[PDB]
Amino acid sequence: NNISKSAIIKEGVIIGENVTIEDNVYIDYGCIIRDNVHIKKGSFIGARSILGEYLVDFYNDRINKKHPLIIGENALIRTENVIYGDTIIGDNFQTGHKVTIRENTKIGNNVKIGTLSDIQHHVYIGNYVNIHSNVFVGEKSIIKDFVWLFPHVVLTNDPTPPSNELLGVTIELFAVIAARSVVLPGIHINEDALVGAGAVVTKDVPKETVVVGNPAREICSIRKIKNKITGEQVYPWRYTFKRGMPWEETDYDTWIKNIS
Amino acid sequence: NNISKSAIIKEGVIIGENVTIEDNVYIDYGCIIRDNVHIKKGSFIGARSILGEYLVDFYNDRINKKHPLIIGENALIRTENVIYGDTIIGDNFQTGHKVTIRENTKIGNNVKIGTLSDIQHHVYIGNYVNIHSNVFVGEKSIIKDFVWLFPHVVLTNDPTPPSNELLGVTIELFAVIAARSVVLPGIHINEDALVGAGAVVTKDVPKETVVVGNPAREICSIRKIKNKITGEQVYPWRYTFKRGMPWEETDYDTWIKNIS
Amino acid sequence: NNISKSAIIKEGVIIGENVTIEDNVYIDYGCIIRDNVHIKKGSFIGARSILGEYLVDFYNDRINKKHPLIIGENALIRTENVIYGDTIIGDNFQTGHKVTIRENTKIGNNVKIGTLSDIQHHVYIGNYVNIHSNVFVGEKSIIKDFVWLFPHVVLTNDPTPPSNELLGVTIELFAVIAARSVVLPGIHINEDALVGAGAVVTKDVPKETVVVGNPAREICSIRKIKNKITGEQVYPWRYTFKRGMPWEETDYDTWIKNIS
Numbered sequence: 076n077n078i079s080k081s082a083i084i085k086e087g088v089i090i091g092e093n094v095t096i097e098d099n100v101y102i103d104y105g106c107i108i109r110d111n112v113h114i115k116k117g118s119f120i121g122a123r124s125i126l127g128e129y130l131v132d133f134y135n136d137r138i139n140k141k142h143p144l145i146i147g148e149n150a151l152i153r154t155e156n157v158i159y160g161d162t163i164i165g166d167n168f169q170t171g172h173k174v175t176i177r178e179n180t181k182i183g184n185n186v187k188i189g190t191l192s193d194i195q196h197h198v199y200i201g202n203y204v205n206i207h208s209n210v211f212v213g214e215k216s217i218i219k220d221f222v223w224l225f226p227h228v229v230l231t232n233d234p235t236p237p238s239n240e241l242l243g244v245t246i247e248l249f250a251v252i253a254a255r256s257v258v259l260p261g262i263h264i265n266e267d268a269l270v271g272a273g274a275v276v277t278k279d280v281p282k283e284t285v286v287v288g289n290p291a292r293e294i295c296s297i298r299k300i301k302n303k304i305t306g307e308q309v310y311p312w313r314y315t316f317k318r319g320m321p322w323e324e325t326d327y328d329t330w331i332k333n334i335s
Numbered sequence: 336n337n338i339s340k341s342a343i344i345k346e347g348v349i350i351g352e353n354v355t356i357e358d359n360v361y362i363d364y365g366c367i368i369r370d371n372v373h374i375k376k377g378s379f380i381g382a383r384s385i386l387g388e389y390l391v392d393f394y395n396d397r398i399n400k401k402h403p404l405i406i407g408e409n410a411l412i413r414t415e416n417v418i419y420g421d422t423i424i425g426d427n428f429q430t431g432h433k434v435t436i437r438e439n440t441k442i443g444n445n446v447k448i449g450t451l452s453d454i455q456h457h458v459y460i461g462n463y464v465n466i467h468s469n470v471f472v473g474e475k476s477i478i479k480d481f482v483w484l485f486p487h488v489v490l491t492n493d494p495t496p497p498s499n500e501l502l503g504v505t506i507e508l509f510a511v512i513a514a515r516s517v518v519l520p521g522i523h524i525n526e527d528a529l530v531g532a533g534a535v536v537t538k539d540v541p542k543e544t545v546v547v548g549n550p551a552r553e554i555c556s557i558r559k560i561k562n563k564i565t566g567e568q569v570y571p572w573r574y575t576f577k578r579g580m581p582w583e584e585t586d587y588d589t590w591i592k593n594i595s
Numbered sequence: 596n597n598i599s600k601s602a603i604i605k606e607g608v609i610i611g612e613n614v615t616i617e618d619n620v621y622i623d624y625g626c627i628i629r630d631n632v633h634i635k636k637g638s639f640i641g642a643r644s645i646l647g648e649y650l651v652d653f654y655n656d657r658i659n660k661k662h663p664l665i666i667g668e669n670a671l672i673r674t675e676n677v678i679y680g681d682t683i684i685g686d687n688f689q690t691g692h693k694v695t696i697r698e699n700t701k702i703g704n705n706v707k708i709g710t711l712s713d714i715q716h717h718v719y720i721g722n723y724v725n726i727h728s729n730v731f732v733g734e735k736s737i738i739k740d741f742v743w744l745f746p747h748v749v750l751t752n753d754p755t756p757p758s759n760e761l762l763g764v765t766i767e768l769f770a771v772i773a774a775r776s777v778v779l780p781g782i783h784i785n786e787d788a789l790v791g792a793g794a795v796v797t798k799d800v801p802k803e804t805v806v807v808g809n810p811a812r813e814i815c816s817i818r819k820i821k822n823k824i825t826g827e828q829v830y831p832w833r834y835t836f837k838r839g840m841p842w843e844e845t846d847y848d849t850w851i852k853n854i855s
């Protein structure tokens with residue numbers, strides 16, 4: 076292995092082979108770090124998490140195959156997270172308690188995944204993505220940058236279950252899916268769109284449109300929305316909300332003029 | 336610290352500083368008790384729970400700040416519960432497995448929180464409150480006495496997400512929210528009201544009224560409800576159900592005549 | 596006790612009395628095996644699971660009563676599962692992470708229960724049953740063979756909560772309940788029926804019928820359904836899908852001609 080003299084490893088931690096722990100990594104009590112795991116500098120790994128979780132092939136003969144897991148810098152991984160092999164997570168990742176992340180998945184930077192959330196295999200999550208408590212992300216889902224998935228949201232993939240050909244849901248830039256909503260297979264949720272709480276999304280959602288209900292129905296453009304406390308127009312949200320965003324220290328316009 | 340000679344502490348338990356464990360406390364295998372935690376007499380702490388969980392300030396320099404957690408007497412805390420600092424829990428608390436409770440929260444007495452439930456920060460829960468499996472309780476929610484939140488219920492707080500001004504849901508005395516229901520931000524659910532299973536509650540619910548659907552719509556007064564097996568009028572429920580209630584040994588009327 | 600010389604027991608495992616571990620059982624790091632547990636040959640028990648979990652009677656005087664838990668052969672139990680006493684699980688069981696299973700429950704063979712799923716007490720689950728992520732199975736539910744319960748599905752049991760007489764939901768052979776659906780108490784979901792995603796099922800569902808919505812309404816026979824990618828008729832699904840089924844190596848007809 077390769078563990079930095081500056082890394083902090085608490086009691087109970089169990090470590091396998093081909094593991095690399097960078098400078099200033101703090102690995103809390105009882106974590107289990109299986110083989111082929113690489114933790115980047117300054118990350119914090121929560122108590123009892125288990126990284127490099129066994130893929131199915133393992134169970135064939137109980138011999139662990141190489142399926143490397145990498146986790147970027149300054150991660151803030153909370154307790155008991157379970158993270159599979161063949162997956163990559165970028166920098167400044169942050170999680171809640173008891174989150175599960177499967178294999179063959181890609182998570183960008185400045186992403187957050189709340190308590191109990193379950194990310195399946197072969198999922199793609201971009202940067203500055205916010206996934207709250209107990210969200211279900213099924214295999215083949217595509218979540219672009221700045222997307223927000225609120226508590227208990229569920230993204231499915233089998234259109235006539237159980238079947239052999241799955242279709243991933245794709246959520247475009249800045250879209251917001253409110254709490255307890257479920258999106259049916261292969262659906263496309265367009266940029267800056269808003270899915271109202273509890274909805275059952277059965278058809279694509281066009282850009283900047285608000286849908287609500289079961290089945291979800293279009294009700295208006297997001298620009299119609301006024302802040303309930305201040306009465307100001309809320310969306311596009313990038314212009315009215317910037318906590319934890321790359322433009323926090325400035326304004327979206329100036330920031331995107333630079334980025335582009 | 337301060338640990339009672341009569342407390343039982345199993346193997347694997349890890350204890351920090353400024354921890355007080357009262358008489359007849361049984362702390363099961365592998366619990367992690369971080370700093371500033373006070374457990375009151377006769378409580379039972381489930382295997383691997385982690386009490387005094389780190390607040391965000393901790394992560395700044397990995398130096399633990401004082402954020403005292405107190406847990407009342409005769410608690411029956413099941414396995415792997417995670418409980419944050421700056422929170423207070425009363426007597427006779429009971430939980431299911433893998434429950435999470437955040438900071439700056441207050442839980443009364445004779446409260447129950449089922450398996451997977453997630454209580455956010457700055458939440459208020461009164462006495463004799465029943466929260467079942469996997470309920471989501473967002474910051475700023477107010478749950479008064481004798482409220483029942485059934486499995487997978489979700490209480491939200493951001494009315495036009497993502498935004499800066501949140502509005503907590505307030506649930507009044509004896510109200511019942513059936514399974515898989517979601518309540519929108521700032522909504523007021525009145526006393527003895529009944530929210531039918533799976534509903535999407537978008538407007539306040541008046542006292543003793545039954546709402547159902549997405550969006551939830553009023554259908555009748557709870558007094559219209561007849562027990563499906565016995566045909567008797569069910570609500571107000573205090574008069575027809577008393578298991579685990581303070582009037583179990585008597586009748587509601589006699590009991591409330593005394594209490595008041 | 597009785598532990599086979601061929602069993603593999605990792606570090607941290609804690610074992611009680613009256614425990615029997617058969618040949619080729621692999622018990623991963625830190626599992627807690629309480630009293631009266633019997634694990635059948637070749638099973639794999641995930642890290643930190645806790646088997647023989649305490650029943651309520653335990654808490655009376657913190658003296659563990661005999662409530663035997665049995666787990667059939669070649670189980671693939673993933674991490675942190677919690678399994679109660681007085682329950683029986685058949686062969687080839689498979690689970691996801693952090694699943695909870697209560698007492699007085701019966702699970703058949705070739706059953707799968709995904710991540711976060713919560714099976715309550717006194718539940719009956721047959722063979723070749725598929726329960727996905729975070730499904731809630733309340734006491735008194737009856738799930739027959741070949742049933743599929745997709746993510747976040749919830750089966751309830753108290754028809755006018757809170758009340759004293761519960762009514763279990765019964766799901767017949769091959770039925771499919773899509774994601775985020777909730778079924779009300781005592782409902783009967785008939786064979787080969789299909790409950791569409793997110794539905795609120797309030798009335799029995801007849802055989803081979805598709806219901807959708809809140810409240811769920813019948814829309815057509817499942818035979819009307821065409822595969823979204825291939826355009827072929829999907830149901831009955833036994834004829835179009837056989838991954839992990841007893842007819843995988845043949846065809847349903849030939850297979851059932853033999854079985855019967």
Ligand SMILES: CC(C)(COP(=O)(O)OP(=O)(O)OC[C@H]1O[C@@H](n2cnc3c(N)ncnc32)[C@H](O)[C@@H]1OP(=O)(O)O)[C@@H](O)C(=O)NCCC(=O)NCCS
Binds near residue numbers: 300496520550
């Ligand atoms: C989309 C949203 C912001 C509502 O916009 P809105 O302007 O408040 O809609 P209004 O209440 O002013 O009026 C909307 C009408 O559609 C209905 N409606 C509003 N939201 C609905 C929903 N989620 N589902 C179904 N119907 C809804 C209202 O009841 C009203 O119906 P009506 O014709 O009977 O009067 C809201 O539904 C929502 O989902 N907010 C997000 C809550 C959340 O999950 N936050 C994240 C968790 S913290």
Ligand SMILES: CC(C)(COP(=O)(O)OP(=O)(O)OC[C@H]1O[C@@H](n2cnc3c(N)ncnc32)[C@H](O)[C@@H]1OP(=O)(O)O)[C@@H](O)C(=O)NCCC(=O)NCCS
Binds near residue numbers: 532752753779810
């Ligand atoms: C409120 C409740 C008790 C129903 O009252 P009810 O008297 O049985 O209503 P009924 O079925 O007799 O008749 C109600 C009508 O409204 C509909 N309806 C009933 N419950 C509904 C619901 N939750 N959502 C939407 N529609 C509903 C019925 O289908 C029927 O509609 P119809 O006009 O097509 O006939 C029930 O909906 C409920 O939520 N029970 C709680 C289940 C639960 O979660 N227990 C806790 C978990 S164990």
Ligand SMILES: CC(C)(COP(=O)(O)OP(=O)(O)OC[C@H]1O[C@@H](n2cnc3c(N)ncnc32)[C@H](O)[C@@H]1OP(=O)(O)O)[C@@H](O)C(=O)NCCC(=O)NCCS
Binds near residue numbers: 231290808
């Ligand atoms: C039942 C199901 C397969 C849909 O059948 P369908 O043939 O695609 O229905 P269609 O979309 O072709 O047309 C159906 C009509 O009913 C509506 N509808 C379809 N599914 C609906 C649902 N779950 N709830 C409410 N309405 C629905 C459609 O929007 C359309 O309504 P319309 O009159 O406004 O056009 C689908 O609803 C479903 O639940 N699939 C399972 C998704 C899933 O959970 N997989 C498991 C998780 S991976």
Ligand SMILES: Cc1cn([C@H]2C[C@H](O)[C@@H](COP(=O)(O)OP(=O)(O)O[C@H]3O[C@H](C)[C@@H](O)[C@H](N)[C@H]3O)O2)c(=O)[nH]c1=O
Binds near residue numbers: 171190206209492496
């Ligand atoms: C900071 C923190 C977070 N978490 C987990 C809890 C939750 O599942 C997830 C998000 O917690 P959060 O960071 O407190 O929530 P966030 O600030 O992103 O969202 C909040 O603000 C947005 C704008 C509102 O719409 C939302 N409804 C609010 O919760 O992370 C924890 O468990 N502990 C923590 O200390």
Ligand SMILES: Cc1cn([C@H]2C[C@H](O)[C@@H](COP(=O)(O)OP(=O)(O)O[C@H]3O[C@H](C)[C@@H](O)[C@H](N)[C@H]3O)O2)c(=O)[nH]c1=O
Binds near residue numbers: 757
């Ligand atoms: C007693 C007990 C409880 N729990 C957890 C499981 C669940 O998430 C929560 C409530 O379990 P419960 O006490 O068995 O359920 P309760 O008796 O409160 O509710 C029951 O009765 C009411 C009246 C019905 O409406 C309800 N649908 C029934 O479940 O506590 C456990 O995990 N293990 C236990 O041994």
Ligand SMILES: Cc1cn([C@H]2C[C@H](O)[C@@H](COP(=O)(O)OP(=O)(O)O[C@H]3O[C@H](C)[C@@H](O)[C@H](N)[C@H]3O)O2)c(=O)[nH]c1=O
Binds near residue numbers: 237238239690708728
């Ligand atoms: C194989 C495997 C499974 N699981 C858990 C994750 C999930 O909660 C449960 C099912 O995982 P799965 O076996 O990958 O899902 P399954 O193949 O049964 O279902 C899939 O195919 C069916 C036909 C689709 O309708 C469905 N939407 C797909 O997920 O088991 C894990 O956690 N890790 C694993 O390696």
